[PDB]
Design an enzyme around this catalytic site. Structure first.
Site, PDB file in Angstrom:
ATOM      1  CE  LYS C 159      37.631  -7.385   4.849  1.00 55.56           C
ATOM      2  NZ  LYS C 159      38.892  -7.665   4.115  1.00 55.56           N
ATOM      3  CD  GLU C 185      37.861  -1.646   8.071  1.00 60.74           C
ATOM      4  OE1 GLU C 185      38.595  -1.318   7.116  1.00 60.74           O
ATOM      5  OE2 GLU C 185      38.058  -2.671   8.756  1.00 60.74           O
ATOM      6  NE  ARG C 186      42.867   1.009   4.397  1.00 60.15           N
ATOM      7  CZ  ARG C 186      42.344  -0.208   4.378  1.00 60.15           C
ATOM      8  NH1 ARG C 186      41.048  -0.408   4.546  1.00 60.15           N
ATOM      9  NH2 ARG C 186      43.143  -1.252   4.184  1.00 60.15           N
TER      10      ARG C 186
HETATM   11  N1  ATP Z   1      36.232  -5.318  -8.141  1.00 61.42           N
HETATM   12  C1  ATP Z   1      37.488  -4.861  -8.138  1.00 61.42           C
HETATM   13  N2  ATP Z   1      38.054  -4.530  -9.319  1.00 61.42           N
HETATM   14  C2  ATP Z   1      39.309  -4.073  -9.326  1.00 61.42           C
HETATM   15  N3  ATP Z   1      40.135  -3.883  -8.295  1.00 61.42           N
HETATM   16  C3  ATP Z   1      39.550  -4.217  -7.140  1.00 61.42           C
HETATM   17  C4  ATP Z   1      38.264  -4.702  -6.974  1.00 61.42           C
HETATM   18  N4  ATP Z   1      37.999  -4.941  -5.634  1.00 61.42           N
HETATM   19  C5  ATP Z   1      39.112  -4.599  -5.033  1.00 61.42           C
HETATM   20  N5  ATP Z   1      40.092  -4.156  -5.881  1.00 61.42           N
HETATM   21  C6  ATP Z   1      41.428  -3.702  -5.519  1.00 61.42           C
HETATM   22  O1  ATP Z   1      41.715  -4.261  -4.247  1.00 61.42           O
HETATM   23  C7  ATP Z   1      41.925  -3.216  -3.276  1.00 61.42           C
HETATM   24  C8  ATP Z   1      41.356  -3.706  -1.971  1.00 61.42           C
HETATM   25  O2  ATP Z   1      39.915  -3.718  -2.038  1.00 61.42           O
HETATM   26  P1  ATP Z   1      39.034  -3.447  -0.757  1.00 61.42           P
HETATM   27  O3  ATP Z   1      39.528  -2.165  -0.095  1.00 61.42           O
HETATM   28  O4  ATP Z   1      37.595  -3.470  -1.083  1.00 61.42           O
HETATM   29  O5  ATP Z   1      39.420  -4.642   0.202  1.00 61.42           O
HETATM   30  P2  ATP Z   1      39.134  -5.054   1.712  1.00 61.42           P
HETATM   31  O6  ATP Z   1      38.892  -6.498   1.855  1.00 61.42           O
HETATM   32  O7  ATP Z   1      38.029  -4.143   2.229  1.00 61.42           O
HETATM   33  O8  ATP Z   1      40.466  -4.610   2.423  1.00 61.42           O
HETATM   34  P3  ATP Z   1      41.015  -4.269   3.879  1.00 61.42           P
HETATM   35  O9  ATP Z   1      41.159  -5.511   4.687  1.00 61.42           O
HETATM   36  O10 ATP Z   1      42.331  -3.539   3.625  1.00 61.42           O
HETATM   37  O11 ATP Z   1      40.000  -3.289   4.453  1.00 61.42           O
HETATM   38  C9  ATP Z   1      41.106  -2.075  -3.854  1.00 61.42           C
HETATM   39  O12 ATP Z   1      41.713  -0.878  -3.388  1.00 61.42           O
HETATM   40  C10 ATP Z   1      41.463  -2.183  -5.331  1.00 61.42           C
HETATM   41  O13 ATP Z   1      42.839  -1.849  -5.425  1.00 61.42           O
HETATM   42 MG    MG Z   2      38.088  -2.550   3.716  1.00 60.67          MG
END
Ligand code: ATP
Ligand code: MG
Ligand code: ADP
Ligand code: ADP
Ligand code: MG
Lengths: 49, 48, 468, 464, 468
Positions: C159, C185-186
């Site tokens: 996300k 968030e963080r």
């Molecule tokens: N497009 C991408 N290409 C490569 N790795 C990715 C990509 N998107 C995400 N990741 C990997 O997945 C991890 C999690 O992505 P992200 O922080 O965007 O997720 P999130 O859904 O926001 O997570 P959370 O619920 O922890 O906030 C990223 O730190 C990276 O390690």
């Molecule tokens: Mg996130």
């Protein structure tokens, strides 16, 4: 939180700290027990919100 | 020989599916118990 | 006229005022904590009139160290935040205090964070496509300029990386104002966004408001309102096209749930507050584009325990023009962005708006992917070998299509070192039309993985051996 | 200074005491039911201080016939059970009363059943192995001294004989004693166990504590602590190794859940008490090695819905050091003890603990048995001759290994005149190493049935 | 000596009375709503004595417009409904008012609707078959004359259509009296039934009592009691055979659960009232045949969410001599009536009552269908070609049998345009004996779908290109 405070005292003095929480699942269970014993309405998996 | 190999693979896949479905079913059973208790206790608290 | 604290229950404070001096709902009251390390000035927001000249208020700061009977003063107005061109390029908290330069904005015009949504007569539907360069979004979930876009997903599915990608693709070459609202968030993610925007020279156009995780629930449920107040000033007063990024709105809902539990309200299903839909409706309806005034809002929505049935995302779904659902199943396969093409949707993916060719190609892709999803049950046990010839061909086509919906994103370069790619919408339509027709069935599957347009496909296929 | 009953709600009793005479939490109070048919002395356990000199207690006996306002006497201490060598050979309940001889032990030293675990500094930091002398357990699933062993097995699998064998081995080899804790014990089964132990002559070495099924949840909750207190006295005051049997620990958890519900507490996930983990930890942490002596526990565990992720088994397994699964399949073959070598497991079967040679031999045995289990289906349906020659060789070797895991148990002497055998760990390791190498594959299968070490194997080989 | 309203909350009303004038439990009290638009006279049934001369009552009519402190009058008796031969051919509501002729029946004898069930020594098991002409019902779930019959099913599986079918088949040529109780069902269905009975000339022998789903919970609780009171009068006083139809009896339980929490009762499992089983037992035990006095009762039992484990249907199951369980799966397969042959049951389906031939044929049909149900998943995944030859034969036989259990019903024409049919029991037994032996294996399965007897089967097979 006790461990985190002990670590933070060093961290804010320019030191580098590594803190291990073994484990936070049991802390969550304990907090859920406290919350239920306070009659707080539970949520998912009986955990507090 | 190919049929033997394929049927062994299918049996292994069926075992894995059974394991996963049993895990999901147990999660659902626990969640249903928890939600039923939640509703019952909410009613009791409201009538408290 | 000053009140006094009577009950303290976590971040919720009951305050008794003299008769005829009870503050109005949402008024900002001030109390003092004097204990050394925790000394501060608590800002309380009146939430309920309890009767007997008692008000229940939500503290915006932790109440640790607060004592019963301390003086509480009523400011006479609700929480207000600075507005104007000066907020651009600066970081603020939920209360409007600048963090990178304390005291900044104190002389600005201050707008109350509580206000009504635009009148229904002023609302006009938006149907203008917002080309992004992402194949999956452009083809299957086209975004709307001035519309509302959401990115749903479980923990760690992409996300925030997708939010960064859309900031790179849309906000960088943006002639208007940008507002980012970090909600529960963080904090290190907020620092990273601040530094990255500074490096890209996008900060000078952007106002940042942060209510991150290590905050009381009141702050986490009011920071979104503060950022929306700044965005609304930009929309209504300056006639500016506005970009609004919120990460994460589910944290606003979760903070509301915590507050409701503290306020003594009877819980709703799954322990959520009874007013979940009401609060979400108020906030979301304020986030909108009026006639002649554009707000393009992009919200990341967390899905607890990967449960898309959970009341929070379920209630969020109704407020959106474009919905991109990130799936853990897709994420596990390495496909980035981990979009669930069947679950995602867009209001403007209809022939009258995107044209007949785009719509037809998208529908064919969706049909192939749905047939593959249906066949998954048989494939899990017996593989693709028991399928009919039509089904085998469709399954190979669907695997290649699902791999080709992935893309090397600009924001992904940090994790892989591979620079991202932009794909024009016309090239996306042509490539997916060819793929659904079956013009790339000979190429290996991996050739379709994490690449841009057809040139990249040809290069990767040639590298892997296949000719194109 | 005496209280009076104010409210009676099933096993929950509210008692009002004078202002300055409120009993402490978990204190034992005594009330009298004087109605002729149900006349008795209720023992109430102070559970909560309700305020205004009111306390809420759980009755250890049914409250039928109890009257409001009857005098309630505070004993000044929590439930206390008799301790000492005098409790051996006798049957008690959760309250310390002797069931086979009422009034017996009323003059012994009495220990409160609520005690803290050993001080953190007094705990042994290094795990140790409890050499039982049984080949299957010692080799495949070694028991941790001062540890916890789960026991799994249906009916007619030898579980009672296994318990008798462990009683014999702790009494004889370790010079220790045994405390049996029947939690939720069926009265029929409790009587059967009493008579069986008396017949086997091991009753003298065992102290039985029964919290029966037909008792309110409080006694079923506290019986485990009572038995643990007797074992703790044996460990700490008599300096003896103690083997504590709990059956069933899940019934202790369920009694705790019932008590929590009765007190009006809001249930946690899956309806268990909010303090499930706390109660289980309080019980289990008292079972440890300290000052050179130890209490080893073998506890029967019930898994609801066969769901190991269920909160009760999930919390129980956070403390278990080994698992012994008894299988009817092994029992039908005549292999005693009927321990399933593949389903059973131990957390100390690690080279860092048992040694590299032990681990290597155990892994080889497990691999051979697993391959034999895999080939079992082909043997059963296609026939043995359908297999290759290497498959036949491994089938023979695995059959010999699995029959050699059988042993002539001390408890089995009451059935067959032959006495029991104790195989030293080194002898077991070397014998199974030789067997895995195929150095005894030529011997007849029956030569590996119900014997001890290699000397017994040779003796029986010459007999055939 | 009159009470006064104290508290109003939905359908539950608290009324305070003077000393020694507290009405007995279940007494009917009267209150006035004087607001012009909603002016009426509320009938309240005393449900609880709360103490302090207060009583909690259930309103039989909506309480909108009711004012605190209005006079409440005690009639000194429970709700009473008219009884006698005069109720035949008329439509009443739960309170005994004549809907189709207001004021009619006011001079009749009136019986209280609250009554104890027959004494146990007066009860007599009933083991006489009631032939219907429906193949599935006659073969696998034979109904009992003078016994209790139920039709279980989820929403929209054919409970009401089957009720109308049984009215057509049983009530049309019934010597005695019929009583229909519409309990919390659609007003449109009530009007349709009224018109249909009038046109069929059965109305003159039928007493209709309607309390619809739009009524407050009290009316839905008491309408079943009113209709049962009329039926009980016919059974005990007139001494003639009575047909009793209830649709839907689950609405009684649902209304009880609706008012339970407002009556101050702590909820039981699945949100039902703690007194579910006891109230259902009272009502059902009143619905019975005594020695020499026959009531054949047919009840439609709604199964919430198709969940047959739900406490309401689970508790209801114990009160039936025969149960025909309708399945959503069978419905969705297009099989009508959507009877689940494996889940339905009848107490008279044993060789002693129905004879050896009927019992053997029914057991063989059940065995074949059970085996087919077992093999369905294997057929779905691996296909029929991987079954043993005997299993292939059984699968074909089972498909034909399950299609043949369907039937074109008289009441189903409005939905299909096909006139209904009736099959004698002997023909049904012979046809299913032939089917279980594979004598029709050569005919296509479609030839067995929605037909009557063997003549219909032959005609349809000929129309489909095959010869029977
Ligand atoms: N497009 C991408 N290409 C490569 N790795 C990715 C990509 N998107 C995400 N990741 C990997 O997945 C991890 C999690 O992505 P992200 O922080 O965007 O997720 P999130 O859904 O926001 O997570 P959370 O619920 O922890 O906030 C990223 O730190 C990276 O390690
Ligand atoms: Mg996130
Ligand atoms: N080692 C053994 N030698 C001889 N007989 C045994 C042995 N182990 C078990 N048995 C027999 O098997 C039966 C097992 O019953 P029991 O000991 O009560 O265990 P369970 O409770 O599993 O049935 C006993 O009656 C006993 O005679
Ligand atoms: N025998 C039948 N033939 C064709 N259609 C039917 C038959 N029975 C029921 N249906 C269809 O199913 C619907 C549900 O029937 P009904 O009994 O009115 O609802 P419910 O089962 O909820 O009482 C009907 O409206 C009709 O369209
Ligand atoms: Mg109906």
């Amino acid at each position: 939180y006790t461990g985190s405070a002990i670590g933070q005292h060093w961290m804010y003095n320019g030191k580098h700290v590594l803190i291990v929480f073994d484990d936070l699942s049991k802390q969550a269970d304990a907090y859920r027990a406290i919350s239920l014993l306070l009659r707080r309405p539970p949520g998912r998996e009986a955990f507090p919100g | 020989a190919s049929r033997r190999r394929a049927m062994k693979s299918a049996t292994d896949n069926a075992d894995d599916l059974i394991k996963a479905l049993t895990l999901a079913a147990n999660r659902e059973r626990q969640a249903q118990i928890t939600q039923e208790i939640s509703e019952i206790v909410g009613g009791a608290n409201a009538l408290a | 006229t000053a009140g006094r604290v009577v009950r303290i229950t976590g971040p919720v404070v009951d305050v008794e005022f003299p008769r005829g001096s009870v503050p109005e709902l949402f008024n900002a009251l001030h109390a003092e904590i004097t204990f050394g390390a925790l000394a501060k000035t608590l800002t309380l927001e009146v939430a309920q009139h309890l009767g007997d000249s008692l008000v229940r208020c939500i503290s915006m700061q932790p109440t640790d160290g607060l004592v019963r009977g301390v003086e509480v003063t009523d400011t006479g107005a609700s929480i207000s935040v600075p507005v104007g061109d000066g907020v651009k390029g600066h970081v603020f908290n939920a209360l409007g205090d600048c963090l990178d330069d304390p005291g900044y904005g104190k002389d600005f015009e201050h707008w109350s964070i509580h206000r009504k949504p635009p009148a229904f007569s002023d609302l006009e539907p938006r149907t203008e496509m917002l080309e992004t360069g992402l194949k999956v979004v452009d083809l299957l979930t086209p975004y709307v300029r001035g519309g509302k876009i959401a990115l749903f997903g479980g923990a760690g599915v992409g996300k925030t990386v997708l939010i960064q990608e859309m900031i790179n693709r849309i906000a960088r070459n943006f002639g208007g104002t940008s507002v980012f609202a970090g909600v529960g968030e963080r904090t290190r993610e907020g620092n990273d966004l601040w530094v990255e925007l500074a490096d890209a020279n996008v900060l000078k156009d952007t106002a940042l408001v942060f209510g991150q995780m290590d905050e009381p629930p009141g702050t986490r449920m009011r920071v979104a309102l503060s950022a929306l107040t700044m965005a609304e000033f930009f929309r209504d007063e300056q006639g500016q096209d506005v970009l609004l990024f919120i990460d994460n709105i589910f944290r606003f809902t979760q903070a509301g749930s915590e507050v409701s539990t503290l306020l003594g309200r009877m819980p709703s299903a799954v322990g959520y507050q009874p007013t979940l839909a009401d609060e979400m409706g108020e906030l979301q309806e304020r986030i909108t584009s009026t006639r002649g005034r554009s707000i393009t809002s992009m919200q990341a929505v967390y899905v607890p325990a990967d449960d898309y049935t959970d009341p929070a995302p379920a209630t969020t779904f109704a407020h959106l023009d474009a919905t991109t659902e990130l799936s853990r199943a897709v994420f596990s396969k390495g496909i980035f962005p981990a979009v669930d093409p069947l679950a995602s949707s867009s209001t403007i993916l209809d022939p009258a708006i995107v044209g007949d060719e785009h719509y037809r190609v998208a529908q064919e892709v969706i049909r192939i992917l749905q047939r593959y999803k249906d066949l998954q049950d048989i494939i899990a046990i017996l593989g693709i070998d028991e399928l009919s010839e039509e089904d085998k061909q469709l399954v190979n086509r669907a695997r290649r299509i699902e791999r080709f919906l992935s893309q090397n994103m600009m924001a992904a370069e940090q994790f892989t070192g591979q620079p991202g790619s932009t794909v024009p919408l016309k090239e996306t339509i042509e490539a997916f039309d060819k793929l659904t027709k079956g013009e790339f069935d000979h190429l290996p599957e991996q050739a379709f993985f994490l690449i841009g347009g057809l040139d990249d496909l040809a290069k990767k296929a040639e590298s892997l051996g296949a000719k194109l």
